[PDB]
Design an enzyme around this catalytic site. Structure first.
Site, PDB file in Angstrom:
ATOM      1  N   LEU A  69      -9.722  71.805  27.580  1.00  0.00           N
ATOM      2  CA  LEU A  69      -8.940  72.736  26.760  1.00  0.00           C
ATOM      3  C   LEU A  69      -7.614  73.049  27.424  1.00  0.00           C
ATOM      4  O   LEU A  69      -6.613  73.268  26.735  1.00  0.00           O
ATOM      5  CB  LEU A  69      -9.703  74.020  26.502  1.00  0.00           C
ATOM      6  CG  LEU A  69     -10.916  73.905  25.587  1.00  0.00           C
ATOM      7  CD1 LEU A  69     -11.783  75.155  25.684  1.00  0.00           C
ATOM      8  CD2 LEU A  69     -10.498  73.671  24.142  1.00  0.00           C
TER       9      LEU A  69
ATOM     10  N   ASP B 137      -3.072  90.736  36.098  1.00  0.00           N
ATOM     11  CA  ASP B 137      -2.242  89.549  35.867  1.00  0.00           C
ATOM     12  C   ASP B 137      -2.019  89.325  34.387  1.00  0.00           C
ATOM     13  O   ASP B 137      -2.007  88.184  33.926  1.00  0.00           O
ATOM     14  CB  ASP B 137      -2.923  88.317  36.474  1.00  0.00           C
ATOM     15  CG  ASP B 137      -3.147  88.445  37.977  1.00  0.00           C
ATOM     16  OD1 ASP B 137      -2.360  89.139  38.657  1.00  0.00           O
ATOM     17  OD2 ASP B 137      -4.112  87.829  38.492  1.00  0.00           O
TER      18      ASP B 137
ATOM     19  N   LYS C 108      -0.254  88.611  31.107  1.00  0.00           N
ATOM     20  CA  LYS C 108       0.959  87.883  30.757  1.00  0.00           C
ATOM     21  C   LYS C 108       0.735  87.258  29.359  1.00  0.00           C
ATOM     22  O   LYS C 108      -0.392  87.200  28.914  1.00  0.00           O
ATOM     23  CB  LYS C 108       1.253  86.813  31.825  1.00  0.00           C
ATOM     24  CG  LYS C 108       0.250  85.678  31.875  1.00  0.00           C
ATOM     25  CD  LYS C 108       0.599  84.635  32.927  1.00  0.00           C
ATOM     26  CE  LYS C 108       0.177  85.040  34.314  1.00  0.00           C
ATOM     27  NZ  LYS C 108      -1.292  85.246  34.350  1.00  0.00           N
TER      28      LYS C 108
ATOM     29  N   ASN D  75      -2.217  84.902  28.755  1.00  0.00           N
ATOM     30  CA  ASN D  75      -3.555  85.492  28.655  1.00  0.00           C
ATOM     31  C   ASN D  75      -3.859  86.091  27.283  1.00  0.00           C
ATOM     32  O   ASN D  75      -4.919  86.683  27.097  1.00  0.00           O
ATOM     33  CB  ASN D  75      -3.742  86.563  29.746  1.00  0.00           C
ATOM     34  CG  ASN D  75      -3.815  85.975  31.150  1.00  0.00           C
ATOM     35  OD1 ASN D  75      -4.541  85.023  31.406  1.00  0.00           O
ATOM     36  ND2 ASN D  75      -3.072  86.558  32.065  1.00  0.00           N
TER      37      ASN D  75
ATOM     38  N   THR E   1       4.425  84.328  36.550  1.00  0.00           N
ATOM     39  CA  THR E   1       3.762  85.563  36.962  1.00  0.00           C
ATOM     40  C   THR E   1       4.720  86.711  37.333  1.00  0.00           C
ATOM     41  O   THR E   1       4.434  87.862  37.036  1.00  0.00           O
ATOM     42  CB  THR E   1       2.825  85.296  38.155  1.00  0.00           C
ATOM     43  OG1 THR E   1       3.581  84.725  39.223  1.00  0.00           O
ATOM     44  CG2 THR E   1       1.707  84.321  37.759  1.00  0.00           C
TER      45      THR E   1
ATOM     46  N   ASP F  79     -10.917  44.879  29.513  1.00  0.00           N
ATOM     47  CA  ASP F  79     -11.653  43.707  29.017  1.00  0.00           C
ATOM     48  C   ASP F  79     -12.629  43.141  30.052  1.00  0.00           C
ATOM     49  O   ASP F  79     -12.851  41.934  30.125  1.00  0.00           O
ATOM     50  CB  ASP F  79     -10.694  42.612  28.510  1.00  0.00           C
ATOM     51  CG  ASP F  79     -10.265  42.835  27.080  1.00  0.00           C
ATOM     52  OD1 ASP F  79     -11.152  43.057  26.230  1.00  0.00           O
ATOM     53  OD2 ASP F  79      -9.049  42.777  26.804  1.00  0.00           O
TER      54      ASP F  79
ATOM     55  N   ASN G 295     -21.880  44.526  32.038  1.00  0.00           N
ATOM     56  CA  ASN G 295     -23.203  44.141  32.531  1.00  0.00           C
ATOM     57  C   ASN G 295     -23.178  43.093  33.646  1.00  0.00           C
ATOM     58  O   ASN G 295     -24.222  42.703  34.153  1.00  0.00           O
ATOM     59  CB  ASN G 295     -24.104  43.715  31.374  1.00  0.00           C
ATOM     60  CG  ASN G 295     -24.685  44.904  30.631  1.00  0.00           C
ATOM     61  OD1 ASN G 295     -25.361  45.755  31.217  1.00  0.00           O
ATOM     62  ND2 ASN G 295     -24.420  44.972  29.336  1.00  0.00           N
TER      63      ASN G 295
ATOM     64  N   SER H 162      19.213  66.159  21.103  1.00  0.00           N
ATOM     65  CA  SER H 162      20.374  65.539  21.752  1.00  0.00           C
ATOM     66  C   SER H 162      19.934  64.357  22.603  1.00  0.00           C
ATOM     67  O   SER H 162      20.701  63.396  22.834  1.00  0.00           O
ATOM     68  CB  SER H 162      21.098  66.550  22.630  1.00  0.00           C
ATOM     69  OG  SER H 162      20.339  66.827  23.802  1.00  0.00           O
TER      70      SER H 162
ATOM     71  N   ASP I 106      28.505  63.272  35.404  1.00  0.00           N
ATOM     72  CA  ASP I 106      28.069  63.254  34.011  1.00  0.00           C
ATOM     73  C   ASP I 106      27.555  64.611  33.508  1.00  0.00           C
ATOM     74  O   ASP I 106      27.765  64.978  32.344  1.00  0.00           O
ATOM     75  CB  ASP I 106      26.973  62.217  33.831  1.00  0.00           C
ATOM     76  CG  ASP I 106      26.955  61.631  32.436  1.00  0.00           C
ATOM     77  OD1 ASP I 106      27.407  60.470  32.282  1.00  0.00           O
ATOM     78  OD2 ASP I 106      26.515  62.339  31.503  1.00  0.00           O
TER      79      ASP I 106
ATOM     80  N   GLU J  48      24.523  65.748  32.783  1.00  0.00           N
ATOM     81  CA  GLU J  48      23.379  65.788  31.875  1.00  0.00           C
ATOM     82  C   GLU J  48      22.450  64.610  32.174  1.00  0.00           C
ATOM     83  O   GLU J  48      22.890  63.600  32.726  1.00  0.00           O
ATOM     84  CB  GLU J  48      23.835  65.753  30.414  1.00  0.00           C
ATOM     85  CG  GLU J  48      24.629  64.513  30.043  1.00  0.00           C
ATOM     86  CD  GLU J  48      24.920  64.407  28.556  1.00  0.00           C
ATOM     87  OE1 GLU J  48      24.664  65.376  27.820  1.00  0.00           O
ATOM     88  OE2 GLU J  48      25.417  63.346  28.118  1.00  0.00           O
TER      89      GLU J  48
END
Ligand SMILES: CC(C)n1nc(-c2ccc3cc(OCc4cccc(Cl)c4)ccc3c2)c2c(N)ncnc21
Length: 459
Positions: free
Chosen positions: A15, A132, A134, A137, A172, A368, A372, A408, A441, A443
């Site tokens: 999860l 804690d 936040k 949670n 946190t 592949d 056995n 972008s 540059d 970026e």
């Protein structure tokens, strides 16, 4: 005899990762009941209290019931792990539902905070503190638009020590009450954290912020904030009065959760109201930034784990290969993958013999290889690890695309500064790595961003 977690429950899927460990969707092998199991590794998480005290807390929590608090069903402990078995909620994190909608008002905020305050009030009546609290949670119970908030992780911080690792720490510092930093704290720390969340709900920006984690903590510790930003002009005086009362520095002077439920703002706005469009915009930006920073840290951690596990698994199979011809059978591959999980407490997914048998077969079915016969183990290692690397790379990419909301294809140098600040990666360090990648540059595209992260984990 002590009851065994995997006698009763089979793992369905992961999860996610939360405080103190991974959370696995599990299913009772007799009744079919589905549950969310937080798995805490003892090697990685130290206990703060004795066995006696933890057991007593578990027994209490099992008997508690409130619509805004995660239900705890069962608790198991073995040599290496704690297994915390709770009710599974499917609605995701609150902030992720909020950024999806087109309108958000003080009425929506008040209904959220009423739920958080009801849950906190109940837990404080029972002498349990979160510490804690936040946005992460706060889960939604289901996908229904009206669904209840379920607070997760009550009681954990009392019994287990928080990680010092940034990949776990990220997020946190904005929420922690000042008195928690100095060591003398009580239940009122949960009201502070709720005040911070409310401030964010109504403006989309944390009240205490800075360029890195320590700068945030410095702002929390001083305790000063203002409502002078423009989007506070839209907001009622009574909301700001409630926030002030929740962000009162001295905890004895701070409003209790139960009294906050009777505040004018909660009473008016949960029984004409404009949308807070600027707040939603800023929350979407806040959330995106936090999620990319987390994803960047997990990618780096997953690269390091692979370097560790790839070589470990190879050494295990080399040892097992008696005559050194490079050929093991499937039961040997299983045993070696089990020996890896004995040495490493990483895959909560793989803490059961049949889970490992299944994972080995998935790998063999990719390559592949016939299951056995006898198998070239070096190729099995490559595939089992390339699978993980691919999966990690895809995980990061989705988070990059999510962040790049203008499509972008690029993240600017300013944006990098913000992301790496949240990730607590040193400013001259990431700039240094950006220099070896960006020789033109200001970026970066996704491939370049990924290369920077590889350079920030010694690759
Ligand atoms: C966000 C995701 C990873 N996640 N995490 C959880 C989750 C979070 C915290 C949990 C705490 C749990 O136990 C708390 C506990 C148990 C024993 C003693 C103490 Cl002090 C505290 C058990 C399951 C949990 C499960 C979760 C859930 N229940 N449903 C849906 N998604 C969930």
């Amino acid at each position: 005899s002590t009851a065994i977690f995997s006698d009763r429950y089979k793992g369905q899927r992961v999860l996610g990762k939360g405080s103190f460990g991974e959370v696995i969707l599990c299913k009772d092998k007799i009744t079919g009941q589905e549950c969310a199991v937080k798995v805490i590794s003892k090697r990685q998480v130290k206990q703060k209290t004795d066995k006696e005290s933890l057991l007593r807390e578990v027994q209490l929590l099992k008997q508690l019931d409130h619509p805004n608090i995660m239900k705890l069903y069962e608790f198991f402990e073995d040599k290496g792990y704690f297994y915390l078995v709770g009710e599974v909620y499917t609605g995701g994190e609150l902030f992720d539902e909020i950024i999806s909608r087109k309108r958000f008002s003080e009425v929506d905020a008040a209904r959220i905070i009423r739920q958080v305050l009801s849950g906190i009030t109940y837990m404080h009546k029972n002498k349990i503190v979160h510490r804690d609290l936040k946005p992460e949670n706060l889960l939604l119970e289901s996908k229904s638009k009206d669904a209840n908030i379920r607070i997760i992780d009550f009681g954990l911080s009392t019994h287990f020590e928080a990680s010092k690792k940034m990949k776990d720490k990220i997020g946190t510092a904005y929420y922690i009450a000042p008195e928690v930093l100095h060591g003398t704290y009580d239940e009122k720390c949960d009201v502070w954290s709720t005040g911070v969340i409310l401030y964010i709900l109504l403006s989309g920006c944390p009240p205490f912020n800075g360029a890195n984690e320590y700068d945030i903590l410095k702002k929390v510790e001083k305790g000063k904030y203002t409502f002078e930003l423009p989007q506070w002009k839209k907001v009622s005086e009574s909301a700001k009065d409630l926030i002030r009362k929740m962000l009162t520095y001295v905890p004895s002077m701070r409003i209790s959760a139960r009294d906050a439920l009777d505040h004018e703002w909660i009473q008016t706005y949960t029984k004409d109201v404009p949308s807070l469009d600027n707040a939603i915009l800023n929350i979407r930006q806040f959330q995106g930034t936090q999620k990319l920073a987390q994803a960047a840290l997990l990618y780096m951690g997953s690269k390091l784990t692979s370097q560790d596990e790839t070589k470990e698994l190879t050494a295990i199979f080399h040892k097992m290969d008696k005559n050194g011809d490079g050929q093991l059978d499937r039961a040997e591959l299983i045993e070696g993958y089990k020996e890896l999980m004995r040495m490493k407490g990483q895959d909560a997914s793989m803490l059961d013999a049949s889970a490992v048998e299944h994972e080995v077969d998935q790998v063999l079915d990719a390559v592949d290889f016939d299951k056995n016969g006898y198998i070239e183990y070096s190729e099995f290692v490559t595939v089992a690890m390339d699978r993980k690397t691919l999966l990690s790379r895809e995980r990061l990419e989705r988070a990059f695309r999510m962040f790049d909301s203008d499509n972008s294809g690029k993240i600017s140098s300013t944006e990098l500064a913000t992301i790496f600040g949240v990730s607590d990666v040193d400013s001259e360090t990431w700039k240094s790595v950006l220099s070896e990648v960006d020789k033109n540059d200001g970026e970066v595209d996704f491939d370049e961003f990924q290369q920077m992260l590889l350079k920030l984990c010694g690759n």
